[PDB]
Structure formats: structure tokens, C-alpha cells
Design a protein around this ligand. Structure first.
Ligand SMILES: *[C@@H]1O[C@H](CO)[C@@H](O[C@@H]2O[C@H](CO)[C@@H](O[C@@H]3O[C@H](CO[C@H]4O[C@H](CO[C@H]5O[C@H](CO)[C@@H](O)[C@H](O)[C@@H]5O)[C@@H](O)[C@H](O[C@H]5O[C@H](CO)[C@@H](O)[C@H](O)[C@@H]5O[C@H]5O[C@H](CO)[C@@H](O)[C@H](O)[C@@H]5O)[C@@H]4O)[C@@H](O)[C@H](O[C@H]4O[C@H](CO)[C@@H](O)[C@H](O)[C@@H]4O[C@H]4O[C@H](CO)[C@@H](O)[C@H](O)[C@@H]4O)[C@@H]3O)[C@H](O)[C@H]2NC(C)=O)[C@H](O)[C@H]1NC(C)=O
Ligand SMILES: O=C(OCc1cc(Cl)cc(Cl)c1)N1C[C@H]2CNC[C@H]2C1
Ligand SMILES: [Ca+2]
Ligand SMILES: [Cl-]
Ligand SMILES: [Cl-]
Ligand SMILES: [Cl-]
Ligand SMILES: [Cl-]
Ligand SMILES: [Zn+2]
Length: 806
């Protein structure tokens, strides 16, 4: 019940929502059908429209009017946004030359520059160039302010997951809004786009910016607007709030536009119809900026212009149907469209089988436009698994397509030419970022970054401490003139041991053999040097990674590589080596194919054993530093140490062997040398965070040797590729991956071909940030460089995407 017999008199767009059954006057009351009876009359005035004309200048105040052109309107904070232009001979903000804002220029009693977030739904990154002719206000913000060529959304590239990521700094798996449609099996309740359940607080996790502000004594404008409140009224309401007295005035505000998404769905991203929506959003920006200039705030307020996601060409005729794959289509529920999520129709049907659904949907048709995944096998860069609202079965849909259960769902449940929701590295899903104001830089381009980073920056702009989030605070310092965050490197928790030669070969009973018993003051003086760290400045270029948890490990040095060997996991946490442009690739000699050698620096009881592999009929082994890249025949023996061996399924060794034998050399050749750091990852509970030993679900049979879920590599070089990787004076360039350690290559539909036709394609799908690897390993990389920490944090958030240029 709502007792809507109350009144909105002097309460229009009140900032604190009043508790039912009293009637509401806030900017969401429409959407809850709860507004007082007189809300339209008092709070949504429209008479005379939105612009002053000469004949109204100096008019008598008439309180029916949507906005005012009377002499008292500046005092009342309720002039039409063009009042000073029409009535006082002022220029529109967009026609003024831009002038650097070196310091805030704020009216008296402003404690801090306000922040205004201008969010646009469906605003695809390439609109900034392709629509430049019809968006002069936006193009000024962009050229005068700080901008990125694009901003990467989170997956799925849907509206509510991305807006709530912008507000929280959290991935959807953590904030809980994982899709526009959701079933939570603990609540036994569903969340829908249309309806009243979605406003139940239990859906929304984390701490959004407005709650962060409020808890720290900063007032916030209400971020959400009911769809029927026109844009001109949203802008006027913001400008009115900005005229409140100091103690009541908010410091942070959001505006939302449903365009260009709304039109983009109907017409496609570049439909002729899309010009007018872009003109209209620009006009809105112009209203806001003219309004700020009237209040003397246009050199005081920080403005962020930001989108949620882009828009791709999608039509009804590009729909795959699960009815063409499965027989049992009626025993499943599908969340359809630009992604698929599948679960059982009934929990009381114990005949439904995920393994057979996956198999029926895997590489079944030559042109197939979706790929099925168990959620834990999705690329780790999507961070899309650790939530009970995410179904175990996921379909990654190719850009430009849909998936649906049955044809009747598409014509009885073409009306549309655009959609979004695809993998967040697709170019069409990228969106926009512009920052304009005193705290932002002047006429500055920054590299593309992820939207999870913005919460921390918005907190910095407002003097707030961010709640714990998935941004890397300090990675976006280069966007700001002032208010930078000055991060400190994490402390190392575990110090390494540096073992010498401590065991005779006969103390080991590992069931390993090697044909290595044939053998100066030349190169026995000199191999002592290589086992104490003489080559270490060549192979470890950025310091030892720091171990950020409590453990026991040893640093091991070799001619061609250095490792951090875990006595707990029986294998390296990391292995570091440098491959110069000139380095040569060699084979594994026939007499050394099955060679494994005890490491006399590491006890038998903290070593792997070859018997375990012999008895495990599913599991083989590989090496972290590849024997193919040995510097010399004698150095090659080091690569067959038991301390460089790791468990690998035969199917995975196909990928790994190709990476190590063919790709590393190709990269050194292209990048003028590369430094490689490789290692294992254990993430059996798919939380994106390193597993403790008691979380490991699989071991090499009969042993304490844990099986990794993934293998990583971080590949670093000089950004100025005229310098070799091992003598780089300036900024670095990095690419990284996190490959799933799987016992088949079913993910790769062309895997029965030569590795040269499928492996690199796999590796690109599994591209990763260094920060993703940090989370998964408890390691901290690049501890000793000559670069600023903030720059290193930017490098660690970089993703190499392998998309063409926008
Ligand atoms: C991205 O960033 C995020 C944010 O930092 C990272 O996410 C965090 O990761 C932590 C480690 O996994 C995780 O720690 C949990 O916390 C459990 C308690 O959780 C509740 O409280 C949170 C705090 O809220 C308050 O925050 C501020 C202070 O910061 C306060 O001032 C306010 O008053 C706030 O209320 C709250 O955020 C959290 O939210 C989740 O759950 C809600 C449902 O209740 C959802 O609405 C919401 O969306 C969140 O859901 C996500 O996270 C949960 C896990 O919490 C996950 O299940 C969902 O899928 C979803 O992803 C909660 O309301 C705490 O109990 C845990 O402790 C257990 O483990 C430790 C291990 O060391 C034990 O020592 C400890 O004893 C305990 O064990 C006991 O229970 C075990 C399991 O039941 C059992 O086996 C054992 O035997 C014991 O009985 C642990 O600390 C954070 O909660 C989490 N935060 C968020 C927001 O997600 C994330 O890691 C980052 N991602 C990457 C890749 O880096
Ligand atoms: O007004 C809205 O959103 C504004 C906003 C901006 C930012 Cl940056 C963060 C968030 Cl959480 C929200 N919305 C209005 C409703 C229309 N469709 C669904 C709802 C989203
Ligand atoms: Ca884990
Ligand atoms: Cl969805
Ligand atoms: Cl295979
Ligand atoms: Cl551990
Ligand atoms: Cl593009
Ligand atoms: Zn949309």
C-alpha cells in the first residue's frame, strides 16, 4: 500500500527516499508506482518547454513553467539552461575556446569540485570518430579533456552488469548482477528486467559509489532515473541540486541516457536512423555545460562522459537453435541471445546430464557460431564463474549472432538489427571515456583501460577511501593532474632459501633415468658461476617476483634460467628466462627424450618422482624452461632437472610444445628479444585467487604432486623495439596468457590439424593481464625496474587483445 494522499509540495526530487506507506517524491517513485498524487503537476512541469526565447527575458515569474527566464531565476537555480545566452548576450559553452583548467575555479563555499557522471547506454567507442560531425559538445569535452580511444566493458556486455561495475569497481561475479536475467538457487528467486523483485536489496552486492560517499560524509545525488522523466528535466534537477546550500548540496551526481542503445537495437549501430539520437545526446551535454557555465561551475566540476557497452549488427536470421543439436530440448532452461546460460528445467529430474549436453553442443557443425563451456573453463580474463547465479553451462556466442532454444522463441515469444552482450574483447562492444575538469589532465590521450578501474578514480576525485574492489588503485593515476593515489608495493611475506649442493645422486630414488654420464678448469670454474647467479641479470630482468603468502621455496640458478621452486607444491611457482633475437632453437636429442635428473640442491623428499608419472596412465610431464632453447649442449642438461618438470596431460603438451618450440622464438624475433616468466596456476574453486594446498582436487596418481588447472606465461620486451629486451632503457611492453590445463583439445575445433593451424588461436582466446596472474599465484612481478610504480601498475593491467584497430 502507498497512501498517495500526501503531497510533493516543496519535496520535488527529494534526496532521501521516505519509508512507505507515505508517498514518495524522489526520482524513482514512478518506477515503484508510489509517487504522491501531485508529483506530475509539481515535479514534472513542461509548460513552455525547455528553452528561453527573447520574449520571455525578464518575464514575471510564473511557477507553472518548466523552467524560468525571469530575473530571479539564477537565485532560484531554475533558469532554462540557455537563459544567459538568450537574455544576457552570453556564448554557449561549446563556442568558447578551451582554456586549461589548472586549478578549480569554484564559487565560495564549495569544499571540493563536484563530480558529474554522464552515462550513455550503448555508446560504442567508434562513435567518437564516426559521429564527430554531429556531436560538437562531446567532441569539445573529448579534445579539451582527458580521453581514451576506448574503454573495455566487463562480461557480459549488458547494461546492468556494466553500470553496477562502474559504481562498484567489482566484476559481475562479485557484485552479483551477472546478467540482465538471473535465478538465485539459494533464494529460490528470479530477477527480471521488468518487475519489482529486481529492487530487492539482496540482489546487489558490494558497495556502490553513492554508499561509499554517504558513509564518509559526502552527499550524493540519486543515481537512477525513471524512464519517463525526460532528459531536460534530469539536467534541470541536477542543476537545481547544485544550487542547494553547502550543508545540503551533493558532491556527486549521475545522469543516464537510454540512447543510443534504444535506437541501436532497432536500426543497428550505424543505421541512418542513428544520427539523430547522437545529435540529441550532444544537445543534452550542451544543456548541462551551458547550465554549469551559468552557475559559474564550468571550471569547477569534474565531468565524466562514459558508456556501458557498445552495439553490434545482429539480425533474426543469424540465430543458432539448440533444437538443431540436442534431442532433449524440453528438459533445459536457456537464458538466450548474445550469450547462453543452460540449466535443468527440473531439479527433480536426475536424468539430465551436463556432460552429454556439452558433448552434443561441441564442434557439431562446421560453421557453428557458439562454443559451449563449463563455466570454470571460460577464459580467466572474463572472471565469470564464482557466483551461484552463473549456470555451470555457458555458451560463448560469436559476434553478430544469437543463440535460442527453438525457432518458435524467435517469432512467437525481424524486429531488431543490433544487440550487445558478446565477449568484452570484441571491438564492437568497446565503449567510451572522457574526463573533463580541474582534476583531469588537459588535451591528454591515455591508453584504453577497463571500466573496473573507474570506481577508484571516482573515489580519488571525491576524496573518498574506496571499498575493496577489483581495480588496481594507482593504475589510472596518469589520467589525473592532482589527487593521484600514491600506492606502495606489497611487502614480501616469504623469503627464499638459496640452497647449495647438499645431496649425493644416490640418495634419490625417483625412478628417473638420464643418459648424462659422459665427462676442465675452463668450464667447471664457470658452471659454478652459473649455479651461483652469474647469468642472473640476463634471465631475471625485473627483480625476483615477491611471494605474498607464507610458504617455503628455493631460488635455483642456472645458465639459461632462474626459478623459484616451491617445496610445498614440488614444482616452480615461476621460471624466468631471456631469449634474445639472435637465440637459436635446437631439438631434444634422441638419447635425451626421457631424461630426468635429480637436483642435488633439493632433497629427495621435496622432489617429484618419475614413477608417479609411469603409474598415472592419464598424466605426462613437461618442462617450464624449454630444452629447445638451451644455450649450448652442456646447458641443456639443466633443463631436464626434476625441479624444472611439471605435470602435463598429453593433449596439453601439444599446445605447450608448440608455444615453447615455435612461438617463443617467433616472439623474440618480432620484439627484439623477450623475457619469459612461466609457471603453474591452481584454481580449483574458480574464484580467480590462488588455491591453498588443501583446496587441490587432483594429484598425480599415488603422489603428493598437485595438478595445475592452468599454465601462465608473461612475455616482456622493450616498448622501443630498437632496444633489445635485456638492455631496455625505458617503458616495457607485455603480453601474457593463462592457458587451461585440459586433458583434451575439444575447445579447439581444428585440433586434429597441425598445431600451426590452431594453437596460437587458443592462446589468443586465453590472453591475460599480469594482474590476473598475480591474483592466481600470490606473486608480485616487476619489483625492480627503473619505471615509476604507477606506470608499472598500468603495465600490469594491460591486456593484449589481438583485435584489429578500432
Ligand atoms: C574482486 O574484489 C572483491 C572485493 O574485494 C573480492 O571479493 C572478496 O573476496 C574475499 C575472498 O574470497 C571474500 O571474503 C570472504 O568474506 C566472507 C564474508 O562475506 C560477506 O561480507 C562482505 C563484507 O561486507 C561489508 O563490507 C564493508 C567492509 O569492507 C563493511 O563495512 C560493510 O558493513 C559490508 O557489509 C560482503 O561483501 C560479502 O558479499 C558477498 O556475499 C553476498 C551474499 O551474502 C553478495 O551480496 C555479494 O555480491 C558477495 O558475493 C560474492 O562473494 C561471495 C563470498 O563472500 C561469493 O560466495 C559469491 O559468489 C560472490 O562472488 C558477504 O556478505 C567470509 O565469510 C569469508 O571467510 C571464510 O574464508 C576464510 C578463508 O581465509 C576463513 O578463514 C573464514 O573463517 C571463513 O571460513 C568459514 O566459511 C567457509 C565457507 O563458508 C568454510 O569453508 C569454513 O569451514 C568456515 O566456516 C571470506 O573472508 C569477500 O567477501 C569478497 N567480497 C565481495 C564483495 O565479493 C574478489 O576476490 C576480487 N576478485 C579477484 C579475482 O581478485
Ligand atoms: O538511471 C539509471 O542508471 C544511472 C547509473 C549510472 C551509473 Cl555510472 C551507475 C549506475 Cl549503477 C547507474 N538507470 C535507469 C534504469 C533504466 N534501465 C535500468 C536502470 C538504470
Ligand atoms: Ca582459488
Ligand atoms: Cl544476460
Ligand atoms: Cl589433442
Ligand atoms: Cl599454500
Ligand atoms: Cl570498431
Ligand atoms: Zn541494449
Amino acid at each position: 500500500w502507498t497512501a498517495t494522499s500526501g503531497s510533493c509540495k516543496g519535496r520535488c526530487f527529494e534526496l532521501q527516499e521516505v519509508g512507505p506507506p507515505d508517498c514518495r517524491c524522489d526520482n524513482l517513485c514512478k518506477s515503484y508506482s508510489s509517487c504522491c498524487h501531485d508529483f506530475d503537476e509539481l515535479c514534472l512541469k513542461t509548460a513552455r518547454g525547455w528553452e528561453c526565447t527573447k520574449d520571455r527575458c525578464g518575464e514575471v515569474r510564473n511557477e507553472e513553467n518548466a523552467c524560468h527566464c525571469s530575473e530571479d531565476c539564477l537565485s532560484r537555480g531554475d533558469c532554462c539552461t540557455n537563459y544567459q545566452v538568450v537574455c544576457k548576450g552570453e556564448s554557449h559553452w561549446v563556442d568558447d575556446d578551451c582554456e586549461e583548467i589548472k586549478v578549480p575555479e569554484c564559487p565560495a563555499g564549495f569544499v571540493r569540485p563536484p563530480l558529474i557522471i554522464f552515462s550513455v547506454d550503448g555508446f560504442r567507442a567508434s562513435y567518437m570518430k564516426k559521429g564527430s560531425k554531429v556531436m560538437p559538445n562531446i567532441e569539445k569535452l573529448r579534445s579539451c579533456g582527458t580521453h581514451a580511444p576506448y574503454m573495455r566493458p566487463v562480461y557480459p556486455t549488458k547494461t546492468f552488469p556494466n553500470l553496477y561495475t562502474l559504481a562498484t569497481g567489482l566484476y559481475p561475479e562479485s557484485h552479483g548482477i551477472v546478467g540482465n536475467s538471473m535465478y538465485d538457487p539459494v533464494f529460490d528467486a528470479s530477477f527480471h528486467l521488468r518487475g519489482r523483485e529486481k529492487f530487492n536489496h539482496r540482489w546487489w552486492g558490494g558497495q556502490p559509489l553513492w554508499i561509499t560517499a554517504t558513509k564518509q560524509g559526502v552527499r550524493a545525488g540519486t543515481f537512477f532515473w525513471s524512464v519517463s522523466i525526460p532528459h531536460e528535466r534530469r539536467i534541470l534537477t541536477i542543476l537545481q541540486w547544485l544550487s542547494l546550500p553547502d550543508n545540503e548540496r551533493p558532491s556527486v551526481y549521475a545522469f543516464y541516457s537510454e540512447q543510443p542503445d534504444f535506437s541501436g537495437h532497432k536500426y543497428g549501430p550505424f543505421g541512418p536512423e542513428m544520427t539523430n539520437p547522437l545529435r540529441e545526446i550532444d544537445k543534452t551535454v550542451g544543456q548541462l555545460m551551458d547550465g554549469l557555465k551559468q552557475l559559474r561551475l564550468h571550471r569547477c566540476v569534474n565531468v565524466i562522459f562514459v558508456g556501458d557497452h557498445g552495439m553490434e549488427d545482429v539480425t533474426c536470421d543469424r540465430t543458432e537453435f539448440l533444437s538443431n543439436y540436442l534431442t532433449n530440448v524440453d528438459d533445459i532452461t536457456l537464458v538466450p541471445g548474445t550469450l547462453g546460460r543452460i540449466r535443468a528445467k527440473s531439479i527433480n529430474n536426475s536424468k539430465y546430464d551436463p556432460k552429454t549436453i556439452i558433448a552434443a553442443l561441441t564442434c557439431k557443425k562446421p560453421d557453428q557460431h557458439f562454443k559451449p563451456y563449463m563455466k570454470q573453463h571460460l577464459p580467466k580474463r572474463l572472471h565469470y564463474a564464482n557466483n551461484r547465479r552463473i549456470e555451470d553451462i555457458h555458451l560463448l556466442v560469436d559476434r553478430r549472432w544469437h543463440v535460442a532454444r527453438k525457432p518458435l522463441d524467435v517469432y512467437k515469444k525481424c524486429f531488431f538489427q543490433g544487440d550487445h552482450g558478446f565477449d568484452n574483447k570484441v571491438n564492437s562492444m568497446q565503449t567510451v571515456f572522457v574526463g573533463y575538469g580541474p582534476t583531469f589532465k588537459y588535451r591528454t590521450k591515455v591508453p584504453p583501460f577497463e571500466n573496473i578501474e573507474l570506481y577508484n578514480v571516482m573515489c580519488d576525485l571525491l576524496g573518498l577511501k574506496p571499498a575493496p574492489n577489483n581495480g588496481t588503485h594507482g593504475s589510472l593515476n596518469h589520467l589525473l593532474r592532482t589527487n593521484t593515489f600514491r600506492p606502495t608495493m606489497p611487502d614480501e611475506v616469504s623469503r627464499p632459501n638459496y640452497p647449495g649442493i647438499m645431496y649425493l645422486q644416490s640418495e634419490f630414488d625417483l625412478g628417473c633415468t638420464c643418459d648424462d654420464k659422459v665427462e676442465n678448469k675452463l668450464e667447471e670454474l664457470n658452471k659454478r658461476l652459473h649455479t651461483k647467479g652469474s647469468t642472473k641479470e640476463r634471465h631475471l630482468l625485473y627483480g625476483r617476483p615477491a611471494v605474498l603468502y607464507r610458504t617455503s621455496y628455493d631460488i635455483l640458478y642456472h645458465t639459461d634460467f632462474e626459478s623459484g621452486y616451491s617445496e610445498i607444491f614440488l614444482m616452480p611457482l615461476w621460471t624466468s628466462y631471456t631469449i634474445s633475437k639472435q637465440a637459436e632453437v635446437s631439438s631434444i636429442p634422441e638419447h635425451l627424450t626421457n631424461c630426468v635428473r635429480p637436483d642435488v640442491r633439493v632433497s629427495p623428499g621435496f622432489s617429484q618422482n618419475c614413477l608417479a608419472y609411469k603409474n598415472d596412465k592419464q598424466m605426462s610431464y613437461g618442462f617450464l624452461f624449454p630444452p629447445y632453447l638451451s644455450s649450448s649442449p652442456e646447458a641443456k642438461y639443466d633443463a631436464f632437472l626434476v625441479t624444472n618438470m611439471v605435470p602435463m596431460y598429453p593433449a596439453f603438451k601439444r599446445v605447450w610444445a608448440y608455444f615453447q618450440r615455435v612461438l617463443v622464438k617467433k616472439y623474440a624475433s618480432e620484439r627484439n628479444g623477450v623475457n619469459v616468466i612461466s609457471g603453474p596456476i591452481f584454481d580449483y574453486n574458480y574464484d580467480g585467487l590462488r588455491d591453498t594446498e588443501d583446496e587441490i582436487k587432483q594429484y598425480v596418481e599415488g603422489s603428493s604432486i598437485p595438478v595445475p588447472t592452468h599454465y601462465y606465461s608473461i612475455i616482456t620486451s622493450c616498448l622501443d623495439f630498437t632496444q633489445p629486451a635485456d638492455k631496455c632503457d625505458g617503458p616495457l611492453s607485455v603480453s601474457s596468457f593463462i592457458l587451461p590445463h585440459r586433458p583434451d583439445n575439444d575447445e579447439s575445433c581444428n585440433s586434429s590439424e597441425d598445431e600451426s593451424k590452431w594453437v596460437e588461436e587458443l592462446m589468443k582466446m586465453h590472453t591475460a593481464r599480469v594482474r590476473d596472474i598475480e591474483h592466481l599465484t600470490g606473486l608480485d612481478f616487476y619489483r625492480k625496474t627503473s619505471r615509476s610504480y604507477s606506470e608499472i601498475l598500468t603495465l600490469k593491467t594491460y591486456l593484449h587483445t589481438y583485435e584489429s584497430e578500432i
